[PDB]
Amino acid sequence: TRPNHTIYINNLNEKIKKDELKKSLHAIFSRFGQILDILVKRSLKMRGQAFVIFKEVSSATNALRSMQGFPFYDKPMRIQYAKTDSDIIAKMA
RNA sequence: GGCAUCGUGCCUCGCAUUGCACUCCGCGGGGCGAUAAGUCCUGAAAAGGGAUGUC
Ligand SMILES: C[S@@+](CC[C@H](N)C(=O)[O-])C[C@H]1O[C@@H](n2cnc3c(N)ncnc32)[C@H](O)[C@@H]1O
């Protein structure tokens, strides 16, 4: 869909603890660019999914194209662009 | 430290969940101030932290 600073990742293994997931996502995705923040909740609506906020869209695009489907804690990651700017990014625009 | 109450969030099990958030709580059982986390609180920010009542 329309390119965004923030990639939306779901199909994540819901048994990973909040901290380990967040840092794993940071460790993996920081090759593709500078990460402003990563947002992870284990709530019913928000489990199995994460927002990764890149500083540059080029990183997000390259991240999404390159990591798509990657086996991650025994599930393949599904990556889409976020439907919407993260507050941290829009608060700048 | 103990009682009792409330804010905040974390871990864990069963069942359920593929879910687009930053305005944030699946139901049920268990364990929690703890250099964790926090959406709550202090502070102008860096940062720091449960609070109230009670013996
Ligand atoms: C009434 S319970 C809170 C339950 C929670 N508010 C809920 O919706 O299920 C109070 C107890 O939870 C524990 N607790 C709540 N917040 C905590 C925190 N941030 N850190 C450590 N323990 C906490 C404490 O052990 C306290 O004795």
Domains observed in chain A? 1-93 (3.30.70.330)
Task: Enumerate residues 6+ apart whose C-beta is below 8 A from A71.
Answer: none
Distance CA A40, CA A18 (A): 7
How do A78-81 and A6-10 pair as beta strands? antiparallel
How do A75-76 and A71-72 pair as beta strands? antiparallel
A43 by Cβ neighbours in 10 Å (0-12 / 13-18 / 19+) ranks as exposed
Instruction: For residue A85, report the distance from its CA to the centre of ligand 1, in Å.
Output: 33
Q: Name the nearest CA neighbour of A65 among A84, A85, A79, A75.
A: A79
- Largest separation between any pair of C-alpha atoms in chain A: 38
Query: Resolution in A, one decimal?
Result: 2.7
Instruction: For residue A86, report the distance from its CA to the centre of ligand 1, in Å.
Output: 30
User: Which residues in window 12-51 of A are less than 7 A from strand B by Cβ?
Assistant: 12, 14-15, 17-19, 39, 41-49, 51
**Structural determination approach:** X-ray
* Residue nearest the C1' of B27 (CA based): A44
DSSP E strand boundaries for chain A? 6-10, 35-40, 49-54, 71-72, 75-76, 78-81
Distance CA A7, CA A30 (A): 13
Distance CA A1, CA A89 (A): 18
Q: Name the nearest CA neighbour of A28 among A9, A43, A15.
A: A9
